[PDB]
């Protein structure tokens with residue numbers, strides 16, 4: 001399991017914004033990614049604009065303060081630490097990627113769904129249709145859904 005969030009009201013803060021996208025588009029993509037997980041669990045997420053939140057969302061290139069430097073364009077897209085104090089929960093996105101709302105570049109929403117999975121304590125699935133499969137995919141977002149494996153994985157932690 002890992003430890004899990006021992007409370008069901010979890011705060012997040014967007015630390016900074018990628019210049020690849022409009023700020024409002026970043027806000028929407030992240031809020032909707034959290035919503036994917038709250039739709040199948042009792043978890044509730046709340047965005048805050050001041051102070052430290054449980055989950056800090058950061059855009060950064062190369063070394064960014066946590067022993068896990070990003071690698072430039074391509075390769076690693078993002079990473080997130082599992083539930084825990086401090087850096088635990090935080091989700092970091094590689095600014096050397098080109099973040100988009102569509103099929104071009106790297107889709108922020110889909111990547112955020114995957115990283116938030118890790119922020120909540122999920123590892124990787126072996127189901128190729130699962131969002132927690134370790135390989136990037138792009139699917140039409142308005143028909144994107146969590147796979148059976150994703151749903152029961154997250155419910156095994158937060159049911």
Ligand SMILES: CC(C)[C@H](C(=O)O)N(CCNC(=O)c1ccccc1)S(=O)(=O)c1ccc(-c2ccccc2)cc1
Pocket residue numbers: 075076077078079080110111112114115118124131132133134135136137
């Ligand atoms: C660094 C790691 C935390 C990260 C991730 O899983 O989020 N990546 C995976 C790195 N490779 C592996 O962990 C691995 C594990 C077993 C065998 C081989 C390699 S990723 O950045 O390539 C990455 C990959 C995919 C997605 C993703 C998946 C589905 C939809 C959108 C994005 C996001 C980041």
Ligand SMILES: [Ca+2]
Pocket residue numbers: 070071072073074075076077094096097
């Ligand atoms: Ca990269």
Ligand SMILES: [Ca+2]
Pocket residue numbers: 053054055056084085086087088089090
């Ligand atoms: Ca944290």
Ligand SMILES: [Ca+2]
Pocket residue numbers: 018019020094095096097098099
């Ligand atoms: Ca970028």
Ligand SMILES: [Zn+2]
Pocket residue numbers: 064066068079092
């Ligand atoms: Zn990091």
Ligand SMILES: [Zn+2]
Pocket residue numbers: 114118123124132133134
């Ligand atoms: Zn992953």
